[PDB]
Design a binder for this molecule. Structure first.
Ligand SMILES: COC(=O)NC[C@H]1C[C@H](Nc2cc(-c3ccc4cc(C#N)cnn34)ncc2C(=O)NC[C@@H](F)C(C)(C)O)C1
Length: 283
């Protein structure tokens, strides 16, 4: 299915895996929890190279990503091009990088409009729906894992922690600021993917990172209780780096996120309902 690269090819096309940033003149575009993403050129096509605690489960996570990517092909899913059994995964380059970096206007990029943010939220929901319809749990839904293409179309990436589908594990893994309570207790369920998406919806509305050490509150999901406790409303948190936001659409998106962030897992909506509510918001 995929093209087995060789380490030297990637070493060549990524400039000795230059850890310098793209702006200065390097090839490093970002990092995750299990590797660093480098920019490369194969044929004449631009590619992203992910060069990946426990060495054998790193290799299982390598295999899992290929395992899931071979059976998962959707408009709102990233595309894997090849691999290299240091371990490496080659993807199609996303011209607009990550939703996290664009919400931050990293490297001087212009702020996302509310119209673009709405399309991004719908696309990411369509991707999660495709995964849940194929009985897959991502286990790391976050804005740094939602990438944006040449049309700012949302694409979910990093399927290395994905699992098939309630069960429990001994290896709790994820990004704490996005995880539902049952996921932090060790449960494995698609209902945790919904909760993480709700955090993403809050980052899209507010433009704030999920966790900031030098901020009150430090956790974004805690603004739901402040609004619920009549202290604030969603309009006190709307990203001010927008000129096309209306109160109805934003309050519509907040209601979806609030439903997704229900502390009880069985009260959250399924991803299909999330798709429905996000489409009614624009139609
Ligand atoms: C694991 O770590 C992260 O995904 N960290 C998040 C980090 C890496 C991400 N940036 C990128 C990721 C990908 C990409 C394409 C497929 C895949 C697949 C995976 C996987 N799995 C990861 N990335 N990826 N293409 C391009 C970029 C990028 O910067 N373009 C420049 C652009 F932003 C701009 C505006 C011109 O500056 C931020």
């Amino acid at each position: 299915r995929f093209h087995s690269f060789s380490f030297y090819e990637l070493k060549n096309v990524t400039n000795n895996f230059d850890e310098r940033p793209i702006s200065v003149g390097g090839n490093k575009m970002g990092e995750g929890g299990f590797g660093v993403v480098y920019k490369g050129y194969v044929n004449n096509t631009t590619v992203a190279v992910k060069k990946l605690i426990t060495t054998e489960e790193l290799k299982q996570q390598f295999d899992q990503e290929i395992k899931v990517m071979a059976k998962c092909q959707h408009e709102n899913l990233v595309e894997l091009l090849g691999f290299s059994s240091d371990l490496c995964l080659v993807y199609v380059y996303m011209p607009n990088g990550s939703l996290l970096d664009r919400l931050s206007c990293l490297d001087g990029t212009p702020p996302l409009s509310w119209h673009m943010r709405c399309k991004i939220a719908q696309g990411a929901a369509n991707g999660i729906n495709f995964l849940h319809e194929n009985h897959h749990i991502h286990r790391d839904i976050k804005s740094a894992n939602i990438l944006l293409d040449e049309a700012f179309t949302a694409k979910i990436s990093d399927f290395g922690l994905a699992r098939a589908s309630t069960v429990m594990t001994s290896r709790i893994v994820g990004t704490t600021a996005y995880m539902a309570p049952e996921a932090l207790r060790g449960e494995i369920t698609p209902k945790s993917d919904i909760y993480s998406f709700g955090v993403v919806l809050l980052e899209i509305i507010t433009g704030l990172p999920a966790v900031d050490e030098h901020r009150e509150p430090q956790l974004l999901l805690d603004i739901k209780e402040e609004i619920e406790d009549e202290e604030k409303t969603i309009e006190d948190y709307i990203d001010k780096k927008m000129n096309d936001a209306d109160s109805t659409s934003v309050e519509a998106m907040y209601s979806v996120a609030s439903q997704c962030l229900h502390e009880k897992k069985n009260k959250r909506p399924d991803i299909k309902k999330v798709q429905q509510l996000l489409q009614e918001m624009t139609a």
